[PDB]
Amino acid sequence: LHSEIGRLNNQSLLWGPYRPNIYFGTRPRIGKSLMTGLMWGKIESYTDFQHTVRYTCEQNEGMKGYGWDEYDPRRGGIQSIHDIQNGLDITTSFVKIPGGAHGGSWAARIKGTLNDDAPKDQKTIVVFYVSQEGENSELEAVPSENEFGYEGDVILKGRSEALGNYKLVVTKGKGVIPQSDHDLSRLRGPGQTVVQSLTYPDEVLWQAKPILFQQLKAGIDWLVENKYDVADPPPPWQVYLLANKPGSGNVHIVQKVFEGDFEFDILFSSESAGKEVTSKDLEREVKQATEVFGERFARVFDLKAPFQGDNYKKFGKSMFSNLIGGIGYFYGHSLVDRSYAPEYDEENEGFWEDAAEARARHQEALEGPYELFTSIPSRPFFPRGFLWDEGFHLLPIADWDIDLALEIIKSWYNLMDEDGWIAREQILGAEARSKVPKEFQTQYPHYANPPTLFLVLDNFVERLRKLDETLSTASVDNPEVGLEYLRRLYPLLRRQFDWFRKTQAGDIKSYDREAYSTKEAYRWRGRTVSHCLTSGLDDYPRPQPPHPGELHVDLMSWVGVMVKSLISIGSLLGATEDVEFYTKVLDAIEHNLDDLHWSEKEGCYCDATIDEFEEHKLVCHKGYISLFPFLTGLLKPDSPKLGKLLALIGDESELWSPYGLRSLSKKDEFYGTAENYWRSPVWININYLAIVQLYNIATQDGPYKETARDLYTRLRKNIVETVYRNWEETGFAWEQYNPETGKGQRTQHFTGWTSLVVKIMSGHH
Numbered sequence: 001l002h003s004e005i006g007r008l009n010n011q012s013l014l015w016g017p018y019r020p021n022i023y024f025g026t027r028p029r030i031g032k033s034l035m036t037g038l039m040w041g042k043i044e045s046y047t048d049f050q051h052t053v054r055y056t057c058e059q060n061e062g063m064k065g066y067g068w069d070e071y072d073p074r075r076g077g078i079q080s081i082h083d084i085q086n087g088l089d090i091t092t093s094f095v096k097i098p099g100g101a102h103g104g105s106w107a108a109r110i111k112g113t114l115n116d117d118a119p120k121d122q123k124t125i126v127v128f129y130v131s132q133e134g135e136n137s138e139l140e141a142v143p144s145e146n147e148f149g150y151e152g153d154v155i156l157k158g159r160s161e162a163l164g165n166y167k168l169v170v171t172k173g174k175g176v177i178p179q180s181d182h183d184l185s186r187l188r189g190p191g192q193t194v195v196q197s198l199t200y201p202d203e204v205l206w207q208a209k210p211i212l213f214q215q216l217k218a219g220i221d222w223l224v225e226n227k228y229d230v231a232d233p234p235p236p237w238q239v240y241l242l243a244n245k246p247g248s249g250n251v252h253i254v255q256k257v258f259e260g261d262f263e264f265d266i267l268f269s270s271e272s273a274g275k276e277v278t279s280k281d282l283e284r285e286v287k288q289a290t291e292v293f294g295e296r297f298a299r300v301f302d303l304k305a306p307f308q309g310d311n312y313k314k315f316g317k318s319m320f321s322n323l324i325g326g327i328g329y330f331y332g333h334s335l336v337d338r339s340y341a342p343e344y345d346e347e348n349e350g351f352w353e354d355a356a357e358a359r360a361r362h363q364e365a366l367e368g369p370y371e372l373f374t375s376i377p378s379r380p381f382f383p384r385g386f387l388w389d390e391g392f393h394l395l396p397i398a399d400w401d402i403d404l405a406l407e408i409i410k411s412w413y414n415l416m417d418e419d420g421w422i423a424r425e426q427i428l429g430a431e432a433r434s435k436v437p438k439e440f441q442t443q444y445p446h447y448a449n450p451p452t453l454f455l456v457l458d459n460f461v462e463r464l465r466k467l468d469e470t471l472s473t474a475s476v477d478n479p480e481v482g483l484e485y486l487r488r489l490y491p492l493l494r495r496q497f498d499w500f501r502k503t504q505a506g507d508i509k510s511y512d513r514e515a516y517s518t519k520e521a522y523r524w525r526g527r528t529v530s531h532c533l534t535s536g537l538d539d540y541p542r543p544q545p546p547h548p549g550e551l552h553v554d555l556m557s558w559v560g561v562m563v564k565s566l567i568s569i570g571s572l573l574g575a576t577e578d579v580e581f582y583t584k585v586l587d588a589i590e591h592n593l594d595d596l597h598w599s600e601k602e603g604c605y606c607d608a609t610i611d612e613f614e615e616h617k618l619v620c621h622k623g624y625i626s627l628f629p630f631l632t633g634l635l636k637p638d639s640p641k642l643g644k645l646l647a648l649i650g651d652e653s654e655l656w657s658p659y660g661l662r663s664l665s666k667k668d669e670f671y672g673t674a675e676n677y678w679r680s681p682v683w684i685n686i687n688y689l690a691i692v693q694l695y696n697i698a699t700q701d702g703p704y705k706e707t708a709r710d711l712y713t714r715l716r717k718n719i720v721e722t723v724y725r726n727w728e729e730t731g732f733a734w735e736q737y738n739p740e741t742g743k744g745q746r747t748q749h750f751t752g753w754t755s756l757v758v759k760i761m762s763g764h765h
């Protein structure tokens with residue numbers, strides 16, 4: 001039955017608009033296969049189209065906003081794009097139609113409406129670009145009847161091992177096609193849909209924009225060569241209409257020019273499914289997916305007071321749709337330094353200089369190929385997998401569709417190497433590398449990131465203990481399915497736990513350090529004078545200078561998270577010996593968090609270091625790090641340490657702002673200094689952990705029940721309202737929020753863990 005559910009999940013999830021790095025395109029979850037993408041741009045002159053055309057996602061003054069209004073990767077969804085530069089409001093509807101043996105069929109409608117500011121006779125070029133990778137596969141445009149291009153539909157017929165036979169149609173569409181009365185029309189036609197079928201080596205087909213422009217440029221070269229000149233030039237839109245030449249190839253460019261509003265469909269029909277997809281099917285399936293989305297949302301994300309109103313529901317649907325709509329499929333090689341230089345051990349004072357020296361040996365090389373199916377922090381800025389971000393992304397996604405979340409977890413763990421390492425940033429293949437400066441591509445096997453994916457597993461385990469609709473929860477509704485899943489995953493979880501302990505160990509025995517356990521101490525590798533990128537809290541202040549004798553309280557807390565998960569999952573699988581080992585480890589961390597990290601004088605937890613005099617010293621910087629044992633759920637509900645942390649949490653002169661908890665205290669010497677990334681601003685992910693833990697204390701008997709209820713109530717409201725107000729005003733989720741003004745700042749379209757807000761509103765943790 002586990003095999004059966006797996007096969008049905010595979011077929012269900014195979015197709016999607018899984019290219020979030022671009023405004024709109026599709027690909028299946030197969031490395032070398034068929035991929036599509038859309039481009040559009042107004043043309044008002046002979047030189048503007050290169051500057052107006054749109055393809056890869058960005059966010060700047062010429063784009064009002066864009067994103068998914070509704071989305072479910074099993075069914076499809078609807079995206080809206082509001083383009084100021086091109087004067088257009090665009091909708092892309094995508095829908096999936098199950099059937100056959102190759103992951104089913106799909107369709108999309110592309111609709112463009114000029115906004116109020118645009119000239120009513122604006123000319124817009126639209127291109128649908130199709131490529132197919134694979135040694136043996138084939139794809140051919142059926143030639144038109146007409147002399148110069150197509151009066152009606154463009155049909156591509158293709159075949160591959162992965163997809164079997166299929167056809168992909170770009171419909172005639174609706175809207176005015178401009179017509180040229182120029183002499184050129186005798187040789188190029190007066191204006192019509194055109195197709196060019198080309199071939200390039202497979203590894204460059206992703207380069208759609210250069211490939212398109214190389215063809216446009218050759219068309220212009222032809223004009224010049226054939227005496228079309230400035231004494232009597234064709235209109236710009238005709239200069240930029242490709243000469244029709246359909247045929248066979250691994251690239252097909254389908255181009256249309258519209259005057260005023262327009263729309264057209266893309267119909268992909270899997271031959272193994274029988275009857276082909278029509279436009280009427282598209283319209284029916286789009287209607288049905290919306291109805292299903294609405295019903296699931298009201299069940300899964302039932303927003304509680306004071307967020308029950310229609311305005312907050314629309315807000316929630318947007319934040320959620322943008323999060324799950326960010327899911328991509330990525331495939332290719334990644335850049336990794338496999339030297340294991342000894343400098344990377346960081347065992348000496350001044351280690352960051354030695355590690356820099358090793359990095360300058362540039363031993364990294366491409367390896368793989370790897371694949372990844374994952375949600376992402378940001379379409380325009382960070383369109384790829386980030387390890388600790390993904391644990392937060394999956395908490396709302398697991399609510400919606402636990403089977404999908406487990407699929408993504410499995411994808412990530414399938415990257416793990418023989419030692420237990422998963423690179424914290426997954427830049428897979430040339431297309432992915434194209435967005436990233438070369439200096440930032442290389443991944444390092446000694447660099448960790450918080451194991452937040454364990455949080456998602458925790459929720460799954462709790463559900464486990466306590467047709468698309470059926471598949472979405474199959475792994476919990478069938479207990480033996482969920483548990484076979486855990487059985488396969490458990491060894492990888494254990495390997496990663498061992499890896500943290502092997503590679504991120506701190507030093508107790510070499511110094512005058514007294515503690516209950518001589519084993520439990522942790523130090524994040526990879527720190528520089530001003531940063532600790534691997535912790536996730538880039539510029540949060542740490543001991544200065546960095547030192548091989550540092551101990552980081554957040555990392556120790558994350559180890560505690562992992563050991564608790566392993567206790568839960570080990571128990572289910574009957575791993576008796578393992579559980580005894582984990583039990584002793586947890587006891588040890590509970591004691592050592594106190595012995596090595598608790599500051600009585602400051603009333604919170606602190607990182608530690610070793611003095612100029614080789615003595616243990618606490619380094620207290622009150623902020624998120626100070627709260628880590630509470631955030632990760634390691635403190636008992638009656639702990640006096642807890643009570644002091646609640647005082648710090650609620651203190652307006654420290655962490656509490658009207659807009660959420662500040663990352664760093666206003667009273668800290670580093671508040672609002674340098675780049676100020678994690679040195680004051682409000683971050684939704686850590687606020688989310690605080691909210692969930694406050695709620696935990698609030699709904700249990702104990703000394704702090706009432707304090708926690710009060711802080712829970714207010715922090716929920718502060719956080720939700722901050723993200724809501726900014727969204728109302730700007731259309732965006734932001735990376736972080738200003739604690740003085742409440743304004744979203746840093747990057748836009750951060751969905752992204754800011755989307756946790758949907759689950760804070762729905763409550764009932």
Ligand SMILES: Cc1cc(NCc2cccc(CN3C[C@H](O)[C@@H](O)[C@H](O)[C@H]3CO)c2)cc(-c2ncccn2)c1
Nearest residue numbers: 377381382386388389436437440535536537538677747
């Ligand atoms: C070449 C380059 C380097 C950097 N360096 C910082 C950086 C790199 C990757 C991702 C993030 C975002 N997040 C930082 C969070 O602190 C972390 O916790 C979290 O996992 C991570 C993922 O969301 C920041 C930033 C840019 C940039 N590009 C466009 C707009 C603004 N900046 C460009």
